[PDB]
Design a protein around this nucleic acid. Structure first.
Lengths: 124, 180, 262
RNA sequence: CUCUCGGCCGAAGCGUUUACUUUGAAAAAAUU
RNA sequence: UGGUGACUCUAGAUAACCUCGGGCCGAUCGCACGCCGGCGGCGACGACCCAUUCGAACGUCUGCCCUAUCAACUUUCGAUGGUAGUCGCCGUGCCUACCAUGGUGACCACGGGUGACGGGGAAUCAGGGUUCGAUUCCGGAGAGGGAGCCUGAGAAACGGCUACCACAUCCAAGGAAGGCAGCAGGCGCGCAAAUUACCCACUCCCGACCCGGGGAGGUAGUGACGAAAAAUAACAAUACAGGACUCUUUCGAGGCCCUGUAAUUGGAAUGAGUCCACUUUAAAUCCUUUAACGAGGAUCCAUUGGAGGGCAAGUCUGGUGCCAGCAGCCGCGGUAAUUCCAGCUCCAAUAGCGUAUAUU
RNA sequence: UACCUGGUUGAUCCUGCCAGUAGCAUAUGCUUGUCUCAAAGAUUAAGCCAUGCAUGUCUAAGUACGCACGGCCGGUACAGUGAAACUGCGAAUGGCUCAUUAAAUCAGUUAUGGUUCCUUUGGUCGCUCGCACUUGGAUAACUGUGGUAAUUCU
């Protein structure tokens, strides 16, 4: 009830088919608001569903008033899958990262470098 | 190669004579009047004043109708007026030289809490400043060196989250009230 | 160095790109192209800094490779393509065309133009040769080699050319009383009428140009771009008319702007 | 300071040559 | 024809030449497919050449530190010039042949040294100057030492090759393999300097490339190099001690006087911490924001140097007694030690402060 | 902030240095609660290096006959994704160190009318009077036999 969402500089990317904005959050008593909660706040604010919009980079101001983040609003879900950085998709479970370490993937690469032919596939 | 900057300045200059009685006298007097932690604060304010005076000395030597003298001096006079040191009547670059250290020490948020009646002692002003009880417009400032501007001087408040302000008494009242 | 350098450090980057100091070590190295690495604007800097459409380099990748950006009516997918002076950028999806023109202070302004204006551009002719069975050729400042020009076209003139057809349409001759713009040196971006051209055989032709407010200045010859036949320019201009406001009167304008809106 | 070619002026020589001063345009960003 | 300030320029004409280790004049792929048996739109790769961009390469004028216990240097083995050539991407003693005997120097040539990579620049500084610059930007040079190459537009390349030198690894003793002045790590050297971490999300680069790779780079870890802010307590009442003011001859007594000191009393306010939740982020950490617990000084306790003069702050107390020692310098100690060593008190700076060296 | 102080003598006034004073940089001692930046094997040895990593690369668009796959519909030349290999491009950028090097490097200035140039961008791409409705031979990938103690050997 005590939280309020205001939108500073707002812009419709037709060529990225989204709407980007800077988000100011007012919450004089509570903690820093979750990204989920502000997602439904923007969903009711811009009359779209919460499943397509994305917010990030919220730095709460000294003391505990304003919070400023960046939020972008996609047109449809497929465009969001097409254009968003994949780490901001993996926060919503839309994308899964490969679970190998760099040092393992590189030792393996040099190992299969040492081999020639279809036996490059056997090494692991 | 890194994406960093190493530019940084030292904001004080230690005096050349280490133990002379009149210097220690004056510094201790200012420590007493304006409630400061150590001599480095007095040295810091004296160094900033020396910066302003050195700029004014470089600007007086130029001709009166020099465009650089005009622009730099008028900007400097505007800056010192907005701090709350000079006066609108004496907005001339000659009067900048007639400035004293306490004219800058009177503008600290510690002393502005002290004079305006928000507190009752200057050490009390410092201890309220550190503990998030004094705000400026809508921001709780915790620094007792904030140089308060003239337009910003008018409204300094209780920082509504404070027990002296809106509500929510602190841990001591909460603990003593639940004794029985 | 054993071969052509391929990286550019951020602090060595042309100052007019107004790049930051703290985002990274490197700057976009403008690819080789129709404009010098210093007198140009990589497409990434125009797209993610001037216009704020993209926020990273990867979003410029995602934009340019969808095929929305066109430089001079041709779809250019290179993210660090060297876009330069008098340059028309068209985005069909937003339906907006900008021109790159130098700013008053020497930078590139984003100058939004009419789609009618986007069909043509101006090229300062740089050399004129006659090759291969008596066929004359122009080289302009965009390296546009044009065969069969008007015979009246001489060096240091300007030709207004059509972007779609690639052919010249009409030329402005380099003559005193022609409105020119400066493309280099301290006088960069200042626009005024040419008064005198002085000759120095051997060295560089210094030219004295009177501004719109009567503040005369001078340049080398190579830094001059002619636009206006007489006093009327052949293109649209930025919000400032190209006159360099000095510092004090700029502060006067700033304070008047603060007094106007409060 | 001037005699020729062109539209009261523009081209050409200047004037023994320099030092000196003043102006102009060129002079990387960072640092200052 | 056209042009520069100036061509032996560009263009034009003619006679010819055009290398078998050769010069160009598409035997290529994709996308939609369509019109009077034939014609076709868009894109990708390619290409002799021209112009362009990114440069590279040579030249020009001016500008280097110390040294005369460096005054003559150069030229047989090119030193300075001339003509013809060779090689070279080109201009040239760049090399060769034939001539000429030149070229530099007290305006310091030549030789040496340098604890010399140059510059942008750093510290100091009234003015002048002095010192530094290995070091993140620019230019240069080298990958243990020299040398020679391949491929390519670009390399005399070293995370390419071939040799010799110096080290050095695996052997079945026939042979094979090297190159951390890349990132982390070790030895060694030292007065002297961090993790064998995580990721390409940012910045940009490379490729056939809206996709892949990146110890470039980012991010955390060690980090009192240095820099900015900034806690370790605030108020009130008492209880003493002084100082002035008034009344009192004085002693003394008062104040809606002042100033100190109180392991004195009262309450409130807080952060360091432990911990949730959120945010941050590539995933984290940190900072910022919330709940919970969290403070009476006899601790959630501040140090490092000093108290003879220079030079601030003790002729205070005890110990040792020209001993031990202190002391940059001047000096002290030989018994009342103002200087040693402790305690107490005090001074200086203060989360910092001593010493050594270099330089101002 | 254009500054000085002690020390020769019985005492003075000097020359004069020594010492103090402030900085800034390396080392080191002692101490260290918060928080934001942030240098960091340069000096001595351009000394030596165990181990891991640091340079790779595919679009509708050069070559797919790896059932390697789900998979067409079946005489459908080649449906698709595609390991490997050939081909093309990169590996000459970056990083690192300061040993060399004293008109050298480098800096401002000029020049190439004395040259080379991948790429990018614009031009040129039936100017040439002399089997093409498609040319030839190999070689990897794969199958199969091996050598050597051993290698990114073959």
């Amino acid at each position: 009830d005590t939280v309020t969402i205001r939108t500073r500089k707002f812009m419709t990317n037709r060529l990225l088919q989204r709407k980007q904005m800077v988000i100011d959050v007012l919450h004089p008593g509570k903690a820093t608001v979750p990204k989920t909660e502000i997602r439904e706040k923007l969903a009711k604010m811009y009359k779209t569903t919460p499943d397509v919009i994305f917010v990030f980079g919220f730095r709460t101001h000294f003391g505990g008033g304003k919070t400023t983040g960046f939020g972008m609003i996609y047109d449809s879900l497929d465009y969001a899958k097409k254009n968003e950085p994949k780490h901001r998709l993996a926060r919503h479970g839309l994308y899964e990262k490969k679970k190998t370490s760099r040092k393992q993937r590189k030792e393996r690469k040099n190992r299969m470098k040492k081999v020639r032919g279809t036996a490059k596939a056997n090494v692991g | 190669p890194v994406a960093r900057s190493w530019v940084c300045r030292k904001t004080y200059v230690t005096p050349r004579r280490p133990f002379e009685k009149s210097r220690l006298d004056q510094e201790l007097k200012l420590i007493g009047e304006y409630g400061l932690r150590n001599k480095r604060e007095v040295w810091r304010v004296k160094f900033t004043l020396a910066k302003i005076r050195k700029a004014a000395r470089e600007l007086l030597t130029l001709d009166e109708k020099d465009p650089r003298r005009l622009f730099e001096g008028n900007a400097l006079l505007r800056r010192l007026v907005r701090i709350g040191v000079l006066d609108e009547g004496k907005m001339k670059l000659d009067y900048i030289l007639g400035l004293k250290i306490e004219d800058f020490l009177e503008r600290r948020l510690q002393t502005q809490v002290f004079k305006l009646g928000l507190a009752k002692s200057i050490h009390h002003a410092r201890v309220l400043i550190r503990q998030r009880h004094i705000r400026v417009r809508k921001q709780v400032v915790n620094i007792p060196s904030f140089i308060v501007r003239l337009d910003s001087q008018k409204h300094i408040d209780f920082s509504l989250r404070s027990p002296y302000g809106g509500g929510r008494p602190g841990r001591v009242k909460r603990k003593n009230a639940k004794k029985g | 160095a054993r071969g052509p350098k391929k990286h550019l450090k951020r602090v060595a980057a042309p100052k007019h790109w107004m790049l930051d100091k703290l985002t990274g070590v490197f700057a976009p190295r403008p690819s080789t192209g129709p404009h010098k690495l210093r007198e140009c604007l990589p497409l990434i800097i125009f797209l993610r800094n001037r216009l704020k459409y993209a926020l990273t380099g990867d979003e410029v990748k995602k934009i340019c490779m969808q095929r929305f950006i066109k430089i001079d009516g041709k779809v250019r997918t290179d993210i660090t393509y060297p876009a330069g002076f008098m340059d028309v950028i068209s985005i069909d999806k937003t339906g907006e065309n900008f021109r790159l023109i130098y700013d008053t202070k020497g930078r590139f302004a984003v100058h939004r133009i009419t789609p009618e204006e986007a069909k043509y551009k101006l090229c300062k002719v740089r050399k004129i040769f006659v090759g291969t069975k008596g066929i004359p050729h122009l080289v302009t400042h965009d390296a546009r080699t044009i065969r069969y020009p008007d015979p009246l076209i001489k060096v240091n003139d300007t030709i207004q050319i059509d972007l779609e057809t690639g052919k010249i349409t009409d030329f402005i001759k380099f003559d005193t009383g022609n409105l020119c713009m400066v493309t280099g040196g301290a006088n960069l971006g200042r626009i005024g009428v040419i008064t005198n051209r002085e000759r120095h055989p051997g060295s560089f032709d210094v030219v004295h140009v009177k501004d719109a407010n009567g503040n005369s200045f001078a340049t080398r010859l190579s830094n001059i771009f002619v636009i206006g036949k007489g006093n009327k320019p052949w293109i649209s201009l930025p919000r400032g008319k190209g006159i360099r406001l000095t510092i004090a009167e700029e502060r006067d304008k700033r304070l008047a702007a603060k007094q106007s809106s409060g």
